[model samples]
Target chain A: IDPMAFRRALGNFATGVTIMTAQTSGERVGVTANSFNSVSLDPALVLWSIDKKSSSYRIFEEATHFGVNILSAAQIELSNRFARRSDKFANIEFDLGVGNIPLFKNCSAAFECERYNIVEGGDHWIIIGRVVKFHDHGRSPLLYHQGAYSAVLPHPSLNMSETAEGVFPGRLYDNMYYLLTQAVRAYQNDYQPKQLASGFRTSEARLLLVLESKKCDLQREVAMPIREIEEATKILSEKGLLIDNGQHYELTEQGNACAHMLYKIAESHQEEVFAKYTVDERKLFKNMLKDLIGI
Target chain B: IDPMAFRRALGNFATGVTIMTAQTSGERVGVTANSFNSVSLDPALVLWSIDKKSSSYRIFEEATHFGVNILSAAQIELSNRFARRSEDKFANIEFDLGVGNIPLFKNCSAAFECERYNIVEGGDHWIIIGRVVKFHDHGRSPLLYHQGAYSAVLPHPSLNMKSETAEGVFPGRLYDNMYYLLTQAVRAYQNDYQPKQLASGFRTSEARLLLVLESKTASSKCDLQREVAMPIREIEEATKILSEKGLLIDNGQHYELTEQGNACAHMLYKIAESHQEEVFAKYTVDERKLFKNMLKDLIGI
Candidate 1:
């Protein structure tokens, strides 16, 4: 096979970046690999192949234990650092694992394995291990493909639009501005019913929530127009949900209690809406949204 | 080690999904495996592990050759189908035969016709390594798996922003600010198609007016206002300019696109459609739909 063409074809397969470390004698060795995979469940067997030409091939072949640190999405730099032959542990935070193998910190997962067997294949040696201990932090794994680092996004179908035409009322579903409007509208729709049932207008609930954290100028902090905030403050003060102190307005005790309840309701709704996404994915989604909004 | 915990920990290692297929004496067999990985470069080698208890285990072991199909992001359903035990799994599936008549799936990111190289014992599993005889890359994004869910890989936005801004193509810095990013995104799409409108002697407003009229032909300014949502004065001004250019005609009751105007409107629409495709070319099919849905949800429409 044409070597370059074969490499390109192989690059078509995406894999998580991992750092395989082993301790032999008093020396520690590590190398980055994407060839790691689980082989058996009963014996808790795992395997990864190393090129026979690797600088640390002899160390790994002679080691009795090895540590596989699955890099998280935030550790692309760490993966690159370990991919080279150097003092990989310099200034790196880690803890010794089974058989004193070096396990990297903050990894998505790490496995301390006892060297079980080895198989010869071509110019590579397949190292099989029996897992003695393993730990997973459930962070998002780093992905490598086509010779580039990437983050794995959840499938789009997980949050599909209701329309087959991908259209909503005022704009196309894909329009970013329209999406922002719809998201706010959905939040209000979910939030307003309970707010109204508690005898408060939507604007007043927002006012109280804003004041729940700290007192602020209504126009600037509440995000409502001056005249609209004026109307809301008057009504809310009359309803015993606000207290006015000359220039500034504050939430009354009753208002504070109400705001707490409202916050709980909103938080619950947000959790429900983003329940499908992993914690890391939700962070990514929020970060992307923030980037888009110029916040 | 807790077996379940070990398995869950192993799932932390992401992998691209693949289907391994081989020809048996009486049937063609296939199994979905994410354990696939490249093992060697010079001799062209790859390997995937199979559960020894799998029903097709014997078929794969006996086969001299097999096909490895690296699935694309669009092939998630095919991945699911082959992952289960079913009668006639290849029924209605389109494929060609590989070496030793091994069934090969189509539309994969890549496919390899491999000669069985070696098999290693892994307790309850068997590692099957192959010497790649033939290979092809389709330039499609590979399907990814992590934490027991399917996912698609995306390039970080900062990388795109840096290159685009350096080329003077993008107008915004890479920041986590939504409004600026949205404007930048909109501008990118507009930039992709706006030249086509300028070539036809149409400014932004005039072209939009023509497009609105094309859909609701010969409508009054009020109709254009309701349909296109442009300001009334802007519509009136655009119509005046178009009429002066002979691209629009005032039929004493309503405004309408002239023959030349109608052709320009159609061409502009086509350009915008193609521009949309180009702007979203990097996103997978699932991501594009998901993005549209997210936008709709944000707009509450």
Candidate 2:
């Protein structure tokens, strides 16, 4: 078999890259692999194989547990670091996972798995483990394809061009989805710092707003579906700002004040973004959003 | 420990989905998995996991070879069918058998006929390793899954995003990220719009389809799904509604707009143009042209 041709054929199978790390005798081993995959649910297992010829195969053989750090788009440099060379963990900051496996920060996701099985397959050792704990950072993943890194983009096979047909035929910003989402992103980037400066995380801040709004007997209709949101409510509960009722979360006085403060920051951001526009123009923008909402 | 939570965490790691198929003992079995990953290259190996408890496990045990169908975005429905515990996953679905009678799906972005080389037991799952005896690369985009949502890959716009922004020209990172700014600007705009949209006579899907048709007198479902960014299922549902309302006349392939449809689109267009004027009121014509130019440049229109 042509090894090069075989390798390219195997590359057709797209995969998310991972850095599988293990530690033994206070020595660390990190192997970059696109071979990481989930195997089971009952025992919570994941597997990533290593070639016997690899330098760290001995370290992996000795380690009792390992960490799977799924790299994000921002970590391409980190990916290369682990891919080639000694001192991979040197000068790198990481936190210990279960069984003292070094887990890198800002990974799209991280999993700590206790080594449970090591099966031999041809020229590779399939190391499988029982997942003990994991974290999902909700970031875009670093993608790999045909020997190069790639990005997650909307597939254009089904894409249709936006033509000058709608009511806003010749406008600068015709696509409402792009306009609205981009505006929100820009606002968030500017506003997040101020939001964070208040010692409230994004999730924590959002949860506070909901608790207050619902507690104030305000409309729940406008509130949104949250993401990684369950984690946020718990943090607020620990801080005595929220109490878990049988069915819903209730806000404390302190939480209400916090929500009001956060809302003030939100208002300040809105005012800043709309500073140059007239009051009438702002109303028109609102109306536009309302009109596009259906579409 | 909650296995469900662990499983949810596992979903954060994105991978392309595949439907592995095998047939032995006159029974065909296919299972949906995101476990497919490339392994050794010298022998040309690929591996995917199957739950030991699954009924398909028995078929896999009897099988000597299997098929890997790297699904595409168009085959989301096919993926859904295989994930369930249904008896006939292949019912009415088109597929072709390859080496060792392995049933590979049609229209897959990639397909692999592999000889089952080894099976490794890992907890509750069996890792099935196969040698790539034969494979096909259709050169199409693959379907991806992350956090339990379907996704697809594209060249990172950063390729254009960074170079086109021409650093040091834009003062802040925010100003340079044109697409980012556009996305946020729209999210802010739509924040107050969704509620109003729901209250309107048309559903969001219907409105999108109606507006899509406004650009042209007729369109194919393929173009409609792309334009509206909806799933084929949702596209079909909206088209059904549009037909029922006598707004669109479907001639199998293209959806031709009716006279009433044009009038309705005209009304929607008026609402859109009015709002456009409102948003444009703050900027001069030169500014509008600049905004348009920036968009055209960014979009490569």
Two-chain DockQ for each candidate model: 0.17, 0.14
* Model 2 per-residue lDDT tens digits across residues A270-290: 565456667775554444333
Docking quality class, candidate 1: incorrect
Worst 10 residues of 2 chain A by lDDT: A216-225
User: Scored by CA lDDT, what does every candidate get?
Assistant: 0.68, 0.64
* Candidate 1 structure quality by residue, lDDT tens digits, B178-204: 322333443344334444554665544
Top DockQ model: 1
Candidate that would win on lDDT: 1
Off by over 4 Å in 2: A154-295, B157-301
